[PDB]
């Protein structure tokens with residue numbers, strides 16, 4: 313039905329999608345300004361770690377600071393094979409993609425990291441309130457030369 | 466068009482609901498939700514290769530084994546995401562239950578999961594589970610390395 317309320321939901325979804333697109337395509341020195349796509353108190357980070365607990369970066373300015381470190385850790389990172397999924401919630405999107413780049417972590421040899429990824433993006437007032445990355449940490453272990461435990465099946 | 470797609474999405478959504486709430490002995494018949502050539506399985510493994518179970522009858526054979534390995538498994542905290550494709554859904558949930566593998570001490574496995582469901586003709590054509598394999602290592606008493614993350 314073509315009502316004001318359905319139009320507002322569609323418009324929100326359309327603006328939000330453009331922001332998810334911009335986010336996934338941000339490369340190089342532009343990564344230092346990606347934090348500006350977040351709400352002041354927005355959160356980003358990695359939900360799948362070896363420890364089992366998320367590594368959550370809280371607040372737009374914290375996200376900006378961490379982006380400096382990750383530009384050294386992942387100096388040429390690119391996302392590839394990007395698929396964006398809109399949902400019933402105009403303020404919630406999922407993304408499936410791959411990613412590849414050098415990995416340069418303190419205390420490890422320099423490596424090449426490739427993985428498959430799922431991302432969750434929640435919006436409030438047109439800016440990103442929560443971004444969460446999901447991946448298989450065993451692939452990152454391989455990239456760092458960390459022996460991967462194996463489950464006998 | 467738009468009416469057929471809304472119906473397709475509603476029908477598929479009920480199948481995702483049914484799949485997610487299937488517990489106990491009913492797990493032996495969940496394969497019936499799949500196309501004859503449907504694939505299900507685990508996309509996040511220690512090897513980096515998926516464990517892909519191809520075909521409705523293979524899916525049913527594998528459910529007998531997983532009922533021994535995960536005898537009381539339950540999915541919780543279920544959130545279903547519809548998409549712009551009426552035949553593609555994502556689910557975010559938790560899951561827990563005893564884990565009883567050959568050759569490892571019996572444990573209690575809990576994880577956070579994302580599931581992908583793609584449909585064809587109102588049945589499941591592809592289901593993929595994504596989780597953190599490190600939590601499954603822990604459940605089995607397998608040592609997990611620690612990545613130095615410092616700051």
Ligand SMILES: O=C(O)c1cc(Br)ccc1N[C@@H]1CCCNC1
Pocket residue numbers: 343369375376378379380382383386389411445
């Ligand atoms: O790509 C960025 O600019 C970025 C920014 C912050 Br802040 C944290 C991590 C980042 N990149 C990694 C690349 C490898 C996969 N995990 C995400």
Ligand SMILES: O=C(O)c1cc(Br)ccc1N[C@@H]1CCCNC1
Pocket residue numbers: 492493518524525527528531532535538560594
């Ligand atoms: O739940 C089932 O009936 C089931 C059926 C098949 Br065939 C394969 C695995 C199954 N369960 C595991 C439980 C732990 C998390 N991954 C899925």
Ligand SMILES: O=C([O-])c1cc(Br)ccc1N[C@H]1CCCNC1
Pocket residue numbers: 356357358367381382385417418445613614615616
């Ligand atoms: O490893 C990841 O893909 C990752 C993801 C987000 Br999000 C934040 C930091 C990440 N890695 C850090 C580890 C410590 C050195 N700096 C890079």
Ligand SMILES: O=C([O-])c1cc(Br)ccc1N[C@H]1CCCNC1
Pocket residue numbers: 464465505506507516530531534566567594
């Ligand atoms: O480990 C999982 O969560 C899992 C998921 C899917 Br799908 C199929 C089989 C699984 N595990 C097997 C391992 C060997 C003993 N039988 C259980």
